[model samples]
Target: TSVDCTAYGPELRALAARLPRTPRADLYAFLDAAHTAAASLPGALATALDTFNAEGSEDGHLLLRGLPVEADADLPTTPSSTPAPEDRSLLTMEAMLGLVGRRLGLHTGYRELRSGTVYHDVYPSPGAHHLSSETSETLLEFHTEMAYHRLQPNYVMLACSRADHERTAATLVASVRKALPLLDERTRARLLDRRMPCCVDVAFRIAQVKPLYGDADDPFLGYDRELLAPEDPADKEAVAALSKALDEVTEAVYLEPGDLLIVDNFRTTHARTPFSPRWDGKDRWLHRVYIRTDRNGQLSGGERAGDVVAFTPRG
Candidate 1:
């Protein structure tokens, strides 16, 4: 279920070291450097990413374990603020994201989400929203990232620099492919390419979104547990059945330092389980970035990496 990348640490580290450690003044250029470095990645690792990028697996995720990360002593404390300071030094894990992400596809930023920063520091925040990634005490429900938007990411990448104090926080993933056989043919037909009412995460308007779509041979999912609103009784029941099947196929992946989880955003929905955060300087921290590939209409040609896109709520 995971690729143990421990063997590639030295090579990956040296490649990451070739780039500047300080924050990027020219993000596009830094990304370019990352692309160049990615081209020379360890053969096995590169193959893993390439295969997953071309056609994702039934697990809907690829976990690369034990990549190089900074020693705890060398790392800065868990950040309390957002929009990580412009001059902040880049962490090794962030560097890994850039290099590995460039190999997969374009690294994108949502203009409306997380201050439009391509690199996001996911640490626990005090009194965070239940739906927010910063929440620790409550379950972060399963949902497709930016599924309501017109330009949805093909992959959501998370690299861990530190695990929670007890390592109890688990990233949950549910693959539509794995859950497909659990559904009845009638239910599958009812949900296929069906446009149902949905709510934008911003909460003021309505949209029409598909639950099951794309090639009939291998469908993509656009499910939102909290925001999707099915008006008809049939849709409601179908969605309920789909939800239950997804639950049955759910897989929990506990990430540790040097671990990178590449989620197939189009093929699955992901969530985080509840964990306790002491709010100390050593609280759990993970770096998050979204990647958009040519698959599933994520790119419309000429789209560059590090592009901050404006919101166009899908209907």
Candidate 2:
């Protein structure tokens, strides 16, 4: 089951709007302020966020839904091939991204996808097209984003600015922690040191992923329910055991406007269900950002919170 986001959006949007646009030298400054302002948030969401922030494990991905975004209005009336204006007004799409970036310490950049920087608008497509970069028609698979990157984010937060008109799309998460205990002792032992071969996404070639790692306290996982490949029979058996455990513990959260989902990328796998998209300028749109928190030497000696780091893929 998913946390209900309908309760949090109004207050969250209000708090998000007041955050600074200036580049921060201290990450805690923004976090502290967000915490303070969030105290004034209506409903129990403030307390929820507090618990989420303090005790959160499995890497901090959050989903916030039902915010005041008018996706059809905020998104370009026509998908433009060019970049949108930088000087877009306060409390607009630009503003929202800035606030999220500032709050999470993300260095935001437009991804070049579908031959353009325009974010893909997610919608339902043919069942055959499961692995996709196309947004409008497909059930985005259960794979970690940029798992091949050395600086892989601890969290992948997705805020649903708009839900599909029919409300058929649901965000799904499978927690590894919940899944881990189900494995037998031998399976866990095999998985602990095993380095199964993993392939990179189309975006990153000439790179391979490690199937199992003992890197950090509760090491990060780079897995695709569909893409991960195991060669050794013993390794395959272990991975299969681990995979079933993940599925057994899976949870689904249907996001609504103002609802936010924070995915713990380290401990969970996430995916979306197929939903029909009417190309009439309205579809499922999510505002996503990556958040980095120091768990396993993620930061250099002097790196503060809220710093924008460049992207680097894993070897």
Candidate 3:
């Protein structure tokens, strides 16, 4: 579902300005403050997020549009590097992530990914690996974020600072809720709770992953378009059927500068449609932060909002 936030832009910006200018400094305190500030968010936006958190939508995602973002001229050139500088000023979208995301769940960083930094910059890169988030020319493929890892995030939040130069790139999402009805009973029975061998960048040789789990009437999805390996003949056929059903139900959303896409990582697999990027300083720029919710037991008691999770292969 899409939420229009145009009217709340001014109020949202005011809240972000109250946050610490440097995000990574005293990160825990910053996130705690954000959780408090989130209470002041417009009732409508807050309720929208709360409802979505409690009951995920059919689309398995929420698109928040027209939220605050720094004017293009005010932003520095998109960096072609990793690890945002410690003293770098916080962008409006990044602040929004801190505020809005705190309302959703903990902002988690994976120790095995991106140097354990909580925030990630999603921008096109040259000579990028096909599976890397930096890949722009090729479809990034559908995946539930870090599905191979034991501490997978419940939500993958992507807030756009800049769309591609031509505004051509589309964020693609396919929900198991939408695709399930399309599959035959045979296919559903075959894939449900079937743990396939999945090899990823982590130290583990293979991860045991079920393509579908939870209630049969209402299921959760764990999918990796590039990595889910169903070696059994029947399992392979079921997986292919599931993939086709996902493609049939796919939805493409073109994100704007102030748009944030909150993906239900447990219920949908998401991808980015291919887009051309010029070497120019201005290209598609997005701020990404993974959120771990209590849903499906992702968080145990005593977990902090800015905590970094150690690598544990998905069991």
Candidate 4:
């Protein structure tokens, strides 16, 4: 394999040998060991995981309270810059995320995006935010990952191993809970069971989606500030209202080393903050992974806690 993700750093490298190329029963055992070993991790790292595992709020984003930071770390703050060759190793923040992703069952190899890579390395401005399809900047508007896919993830995780040196990059997240309350009764009723037309975010060429689904009281929403396409004027108005309300409740976070933010894919919409890139091989970098939980109807027969699913789009 061109990218043997497990062969890179001290902390993660130790984990590499433990991670099997293919999933197996023993994988769970290894994950158990890793979690135990990682449980005592202090300061920033511990805080990030703790908050992630806890009940995250309606804001949809969590800033890991503590982590490492250097006054002169050789990394950029945006996605436009080219990270140094030495810095590209899996040892960076994203790699750590892959390890954690493996533990959680969110590391699905996307067949269309990133050449079926196990996880995605998201940064700023690879080019146009709408086209790059890999890593790009400019508010990556909120949309569930391939909401059309039958195997949608339960969680989306971002771990920051490095920050833009200038500290300009901010990750944005908005919660459904916060947005739901802002919707008028009529709009809520209009949207509750509606199957508004939705489009894929560049990754899938032919995918259709529903705007709202699940129980009415705690409905799940799939929205894209730039992508949702409603046919009805009233539905459009409702979606627009929902969109605006979500924006009104949006929150921004700057991820620093040891900070890993977990986005509840089922209950939230997330976006990225705009940051200028210098292209000096040290721009803003974030490691991303999608996770699934059983809290909702996300699992099926014979699925383990850490099983990685293949790319499965929505209807």
- After superposition, which runs of candidate 1 have C-alpha atoms over 4 Å from their true positions? 203-205
Backbone clash count for every predicted candidate, in the order shown: 0, 22, 0, 22
User: What's the CA error at residue 19 for candidate 2, in Å?
Assistant: 4.7
lDDT of 1 by residue, 235-277 (tens): 9999999999999999999999999999999989999999999
lDDT of each: 0.89, 0.55, 0.91, 0.59
Model 2 agreement with the true structure over 1-315: per-residue lDDT tens digits: 234545545655676666644313333454445445544665554455445554565423455544456545665443222233333333333234444434444432323323322222333333334465344346667777666566666666665556788888877787665666688778777777455566655534434455446643354456777667778899888888877777777677777655556676666677877677675655665555566655555556665434445445555
Each candidate: RMSD: 1.2, 5.2, 1.2, 7.0
lDDT of 1: 0.89
List the candidates ranked by TM-score, beginning with the highest.
Answer: 3, 1, 4, 2
Candidate 4 residue-wise lDDT, 117-142, digit = tens: 44455665545556342343455666
Worst 10 residues of 2 by lDDT: 112-121
Task: Return the lDDT, model 2, position 115.
Answer: 30
Q: Return the clash pairs for model 3, or none.
A: none
TM-score of each: 0.97, 0.73, 0.98, 0.74
